[PDB]
Design a protein around this nucleic acid. Sequence first.
RNA 1: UAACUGAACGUGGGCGAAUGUCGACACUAGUGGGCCAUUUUUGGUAAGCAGAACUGGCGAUGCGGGAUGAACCGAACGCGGGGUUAAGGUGCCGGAGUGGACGCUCAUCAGACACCACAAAAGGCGUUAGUACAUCUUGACAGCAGGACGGUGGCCAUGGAAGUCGGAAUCCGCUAAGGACUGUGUAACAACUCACCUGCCGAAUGUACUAGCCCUGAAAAUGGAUGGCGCUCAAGCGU
RNA 2: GGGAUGGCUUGUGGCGGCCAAGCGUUCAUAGCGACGUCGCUUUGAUCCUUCGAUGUCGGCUCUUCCUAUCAUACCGAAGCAGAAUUCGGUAAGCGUUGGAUUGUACCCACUAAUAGGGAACGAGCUGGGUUUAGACCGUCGUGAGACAGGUUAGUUUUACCCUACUGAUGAACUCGUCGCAAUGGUAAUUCAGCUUAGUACGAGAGGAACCGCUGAUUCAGAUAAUUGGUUUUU
Lengths: 190, 245, 174, 65, 109
Amino acid sequence: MRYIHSEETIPVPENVKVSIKSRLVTVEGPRGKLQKDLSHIAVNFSVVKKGVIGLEIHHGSRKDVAALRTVRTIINNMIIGVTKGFKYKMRYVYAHFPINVNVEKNAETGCYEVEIRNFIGEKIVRKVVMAPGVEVEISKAQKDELILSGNSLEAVSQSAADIQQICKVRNKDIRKFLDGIYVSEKGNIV
Amino acid sequence: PKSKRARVYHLTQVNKKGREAKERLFSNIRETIPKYQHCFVFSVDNMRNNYLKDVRHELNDCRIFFGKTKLMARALGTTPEEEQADGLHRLTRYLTGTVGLLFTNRDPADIESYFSNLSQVDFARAGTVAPRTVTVPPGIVYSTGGEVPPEHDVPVSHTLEPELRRLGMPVRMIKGKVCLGDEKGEASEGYTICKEGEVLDSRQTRLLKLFSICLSEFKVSLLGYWSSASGEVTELEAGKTRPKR
Amino acid sequence: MGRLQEYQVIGRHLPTEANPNPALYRMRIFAPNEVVAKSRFWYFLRGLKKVKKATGEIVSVNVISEKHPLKVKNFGIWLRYDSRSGTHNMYKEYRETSRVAAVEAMYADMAARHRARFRSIHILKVVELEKTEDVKRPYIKQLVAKNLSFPLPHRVPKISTKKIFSAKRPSTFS
Amino acid sequence: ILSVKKNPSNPLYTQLGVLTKGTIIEVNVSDLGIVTASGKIAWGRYAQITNNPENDGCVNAVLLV
Amino acid sequence: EPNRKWFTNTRVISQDTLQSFREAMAEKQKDPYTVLLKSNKLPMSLIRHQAKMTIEREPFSETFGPKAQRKRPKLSFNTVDELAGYSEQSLDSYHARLEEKKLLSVATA
RNA sequence: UAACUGAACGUGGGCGAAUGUCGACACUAGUGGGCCAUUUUUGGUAAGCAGAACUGGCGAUGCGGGAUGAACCGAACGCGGGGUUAAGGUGCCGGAGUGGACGCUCAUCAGACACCACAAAAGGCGUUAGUACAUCUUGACAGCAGGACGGUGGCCAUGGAAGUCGGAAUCCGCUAAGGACUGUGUAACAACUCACCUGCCGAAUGUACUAGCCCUGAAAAUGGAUGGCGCUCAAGCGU
RNA sequence: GGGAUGGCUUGUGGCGGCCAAGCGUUCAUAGCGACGUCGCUUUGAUCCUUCGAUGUCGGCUCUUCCUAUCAUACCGAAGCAGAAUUCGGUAAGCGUUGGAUUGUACCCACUAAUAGGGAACGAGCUGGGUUUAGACCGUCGUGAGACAGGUUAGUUUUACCCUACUGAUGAACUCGUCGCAAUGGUAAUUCAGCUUAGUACGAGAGGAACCGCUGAUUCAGAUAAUUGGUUUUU
């Protein structure tokens, strides 16, 4: 069955400035600016009401109707990112060897850089370079906590996942060796 | 539509009730009416409602119905051409939200006095405003989280700490003990579950329930009552304030 | 299955000494021509009564034309088709301007969707939906909606197949 | 097995004692407790081969009771 | 072809005759210097579970495991003095067995 | 025959369905227990297969199409010209349509010559069209916020066993509803959770089958085959 | 004179009886049947039960291919504490040995491992099947002789042709110098030691790993300063 018309609505706050041209969404907010290319999905954008963006598909199948929900959630997450931001709090725990984490900001690349040392007493020095816009700090309120903050949910969550995957125990019992860096809390900055 | 959610079939004894339970509720309400002079409507909004069994036990001579609101309204009769007795469609305008019916032989003043002096401290649900600030102190976690002195408290169970980490408390296992930070207590501050003048969410209320901290009250508010002899509905204080349908 | 015309075919058993006035049987048959219409009449009559072509006669064959071919109508077709498993019912609806066009759309749709040929489909009933509340299929219910207006995105322009080369890249917006 | 009574394909096969499908054999039935009307122990009874021993590696038979 | 004689007893023998035949035959294989005459025409076919019970009474699942219900061991002793004697005898037998094994770089093939 | 009463054979007279349109000798041959196939029939096998009857073809035979070819389809043949087709085709090789209408399918070596085998009442949280049954403004499905109780720590058993190591029963009350319990958990408790019910919401869903297309449903060994390129609102499939 | 089964096959037995989703079946209520299940086919024993070549396979040199993976690389699961592993997955890049036994296919050792096959088995050389002519023994035959057999000795001997392959020249475009790179091939492999560290882990016995460093196995491409070998330096 080919559905004649299907539509979705995205409310936009007063602080948010959205510019869409040729399926290239640019979202401006108090915290910053995000840009995304949605040219791979056939969507017609409109302004159905003051402060509401209308997504529509004409003569699309069920898959084409369902893709509008992904587009809606992506644009909504961009709005939430430029308005309140995203924050992943991670905890690194250890059994015997204390894990040393040093956070720097490489200025020529303009990006944060997390250096992990003394994981299970290994002499290798692990290094993860963050996505641009992701700010990493060591939490002073709690113990052995990193805080990753940003406007891009994908960038923040992928950087947190990279930190979690780079410290992985190999050839050992995971029931006995519990060490690593884990994503503890996921939320908004504001 | 091959890609569909697999509907899990439950291998348990109790099944869905269905239309038969609705008809049973209709029969019970329509048979309770010619036996009692007064029919009260009470409201319990945003409440746990597990002391209603104790209320039922204490009111032995009374009958309490706590079913679906629209089903009880249809049982009593929404229109004057449908009501079982006169003035019951006047009473049905009080039934919205979480309400209940109380068929009684007693005095309305006695019922009001009982439901006024009845008060039990109960766990808060999501949406209520926190009356105070609760902070679990650093160090070893106990069962109450600092409500009683720590020297009079058992340490909290080791099986609860994955739930505490899921609910956001940064606990860890140190020698079989749940702790914030270090065992003696260092390099961290106390975990603030809630702050005063803040709407509680379900995570905070679940934490308070796990630490046995009660921040609410069990108050049943009587909205009005229909009398069989006079054939009229007397409205009480909460009836003016509560929304009407 | 081709340019179809609906025919009333009336036939009967040959008159004998026992029955000087045998009963007449009338059927409404969709067929490309009168020979196929009479063949289908004899087939369906062999399926129901003790009459065959050698012992019966065709009293009449008439063409049933559409009363209003210029009015958009909704048709409900109840049919039985024969597959590997057996005979199955189908109820389908078509928004057309005549019963014959609805039947051609039916035959094309069953051939496209269930691989059913003309020889394996029995048209049991074709009815007109007088009210729009009788429409049940959502692909017709989306067409009978109020104030139905839609665009036509990505319309490939019709360029002559004999003109091989063009100096401008075509647009798909008209 | 006590003897091969009849191989249906050829009497020479019976003479050679060939065990094929449908061959009647004589078996010792002392372990089944078969007794006559007075108390004599019946220790010889016909059975028929129901499998293909050359394909199965075993001789399977059904008693002719 | 169907025949009535397929469903009859082909060899029968009485109790006393069978017992006398078995006794005489056993007396015959008692002597190794005596050989039978026409042994191919003699009825020589007539001449020629604690683990299961324990497993039937106590299954392997009821002995050890997550579903185990065994709570009383099977002992070879009833009294403390019997246990002391059992331990002493077991130790002496163990030492004797290691002495026997001791009395009784890899080697070449 | 009792009988010109009959039986044959003569004398004389009068007067027939459609469609198409040879016989007898003489002399001389080659072949007379071949292959394949449709239909019918008799026996079987694990599967193969073995036989008979009729008909057609081949051996004896070219031509057009199956890319190719003993058995397939069309069609039978003097030398030429013009016209029209059969079977098969019209994206290029290749003569003829990137023809028209409606749909289906995206395949990690699809499909375009299949019927046989693998192979099954086979497995798919791929995608469509239907059938039956059921729920639903007296609020369906999914979620969120809560309740999830008492006799009772039911009986036996066990060092301990409180719904959740076991065996057997599995009832009643308060009910809106809640199993002598669906799992996590404890040494046993506790605690959490599920079945079930209520509050918010807002209109269509759930289960099992049927029919299409698609994936898997077993593969070896030089580098290769819808004939080749290549083809995705097809140059694939059905009409 | 005439000749010289194949889109087969693979991992899960047969016979006999129950049970059952379903298929069939309502004027006959039979018959098939997936998933299962039950009977026949030593308390870690015994070593005192090896059960018929008519059909032939081996070996040397050397190349390539397949994956149905023995090892190396990565990954998932298991009371997987560590070490050693076991089961499974992607993967053929790279290796997969040296010997004993012929009164006639299994043992031993090294190693990371000693994986399985095809291109033959639907005119290279060399040992058995195997068998021309000589001879002996055994069985059979009156005999010539044959064989249930056993033993010994015993004649096929190209290449200069075409193609393929490996290398080497070459006409035409004046001769020569310096280049580019379409296409074809393609290469590395495994183990050990030092440090980590007697550390993590562990009741103990024991006992890792990443980064870093140094060698060695197999393979490949060169080279002759040195050391052996070679001597028509006659």
